[PDB]
């Protein structure tokens, strides 16, 4: 575990993370995809061997000894708000199980279902709160990656609000 487990946020490419493992915002089919998933495919393509997994689950594949946790958030274009919310919470719970199982002291994590899978809605708060629900009981240092300056501010405020 980390000596004083923390949450931090960074505005940069998660493919350049400084953590002991990465969470991919994966598609269920293990395809290279777009956004976070395409960056993860370019950086850790070996981790896409048998990475396909259902919505609401996480499947870890090693790239060398570096773990890539493929977490499949719901596409809110396809799910109802209710079912999508349930699956988004579940994906994060599976990430917490994997991070725990791997024994890492740190993890780089994107906000699941906030991009192409958001169904055109702002889901920062919904996705981050499900991340917290899942990760709060873990003792890894969590580093949340985002790309938008306004998101960085909002994520940072939500972290600081709890401390």
Binding-site annotation: residue ranges? 13, 27, 35, 115-117
Those residues with Cβ within 8 angstroms of residue 131's Cβ, 6 or more apart along the chain or in another chain: 92, 109, 111, 112, 142, 144
Footprint on residues 3-32 left by Cl ion (CB under 5 A): 12-13
Total residues at the site for Cl ion (CB under 5 A)?
A: 8
* Cβ at position 45, least distance to Cl ion in Å: 19
Whether residue 31 contacts residue 70, with contact meaning beta carbons closer than 8 Å, is answered with: no
How far apart, in whole angstroms, are the C-alpha atoms of residue 5 and residue 85?
27
- Report how far apart, in Å, the C-alpha atoms of 111 and of each of 46, 72, 106, 108 are: 23, 11, 16, 10
122 makes contact with Cl ion (CB under 5 A) = no
148 makes contact with Cl ion (CB under 5 A) = yes
83 makes contact with Cl ion (CB under 5 A) = no
One residue of 62, 147, 156, 159 binding Cl ion per CB under 5 A: 147
Stretch that binds Cl ion, among 41-49, 59-67, 112-120, 125-133 (CB under 5 A): 112-120
Q: Which residues are annotated as a binding site for ADP-D-ribose?
A: 13, 27, 35, 115-117
136 makes contact with Cl ion (CB under 5 A) = no
Helix orientation angle between 149-162 and 124-135, rounded to the nearest 10 degrees: 40
State which residue, 28 or 115, has the beta carbon closest to Cl ion.
115
157 makes contact with Cl ion (CB under 5 A) = no
How far apart, in whole angstroms, are the C-alpha atoms of residue 50 and residue 53?
8
């Amino acid at each position: 575990g980390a000596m004083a487990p923390s949450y931090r946020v960074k505005r940069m490419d998660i493919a350049k993370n400084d953590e002991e493992c990465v969470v991919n915002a994966a598609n269920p089919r293990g395809l290279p995809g777009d956004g976070v998933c395409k960056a993860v495919y370019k950086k850790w393509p070996e981790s896409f061997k048998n990475s396909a997994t259902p919505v609401g689950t996480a499947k870890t594949v090693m790239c060398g000894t570096y773990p890539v946790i493929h977490a499949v958030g719901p596409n809110f274009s396809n799910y109802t708000e209710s079912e999508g919310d349930r699956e988004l919470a579940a994906a994060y719970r599976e990430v917490a199980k994997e991070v725990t199982r791997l024994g890492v002291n740190s993890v780089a994590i994107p906000l699941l279902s906030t991009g192409v899978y958001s169904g055109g809605k702002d889901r920062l708060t919904q996705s981050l709160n499900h991340l917290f629900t899942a990760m709060d009981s873990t003792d890894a240092d969590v580093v949340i990656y985002c790309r938008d300056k306004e998101w960085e501010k909002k994520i940072s405020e939500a972290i600081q609000m709890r401390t």
